[PDB]
Amino acid sequence: VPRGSHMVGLIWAQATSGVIGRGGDIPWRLPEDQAHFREITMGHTIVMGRRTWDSLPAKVRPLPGRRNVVLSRQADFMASGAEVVGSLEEALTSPETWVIGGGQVYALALPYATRCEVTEVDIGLPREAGDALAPVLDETWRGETGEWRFSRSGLRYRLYSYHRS
Ligand SMILES: NC(=O)c1ccc[n+]([C@@H]2O[C@H](COP(=O)([O-])OP(=O)(O)OC[C@H]3O[C@@H](n4cnc5c(N)ncnc54)[C@H](OP(=O)(O)O)[C@@H]3O)[C@@H](O)[C@H]2O)c1
Ligand SMILES: CCOC(=O)CCc1ccccc1OCCCOc1c(N)nc(N)nc1CC
To answer: Which positions does UniProt annotate for substrate binding?
Structure first.
């Protein structure tokens, strides 16, 4: 793989229904997925919507070892340790960028993405008003589906690694 390409990837964890967010939070806890997320994104640029930035406790922000970028329409938004952009036009300039949520920003970034790393959580959360949702992937995406695994908590999950040209 010759150097010099600008890879844009999407990474998310979803319930079976496609629910990714509820009440300004992720409605489950899966440490194994946090470790997975960290592993994929480490050393790269991460892009997130303002609501996702807000969803992170101040104590953990900006996420370590990564260039944190926050998308907002508020020119005066204060995001300590991160940069704020007002469109994705200049958010995808890095050699490798991972869009890390939330629902709105996934929809905005998907047309530029060539990788998707999805954690599917076997939890039956029906979609509710106000939920953040995963994007729907079309038939252009291909890749490897992982085997089901139990987390330490008993929650069942599996990993999808998708890509396309
Ligand atoms: N399960 C997962 O993998 C995962 C990952 C990340 C987040 N989440 C969850 O998802 C939820 C957040 O997702 P969300 O869809 O509500 O919000 P989001 O995509 O994180 O953020 C939306 C905000 O981004 C800014 N924005 C959106 N479109 C824009 C555009 N075209 N130009 C400029 N700025 C734009 C706006 O910020 P301003 O309002 O400041 O203008 C908007 O309010 C939370 O519940 C979070 O916990 C889940
Ligand atoms: C030790 C706690 O670590 C943190 O606070 C950061 C991890 C974290 C934990 C808890 C809640 C949110 C969170 O981050 C919300 C942004 C990332 O969301 C994603 C994502 N885009 N893709 C995947 N596969 N998983 C997650 C969540 C780990």
So the answer is: 11-13, 33, 38, 66, 106, 119
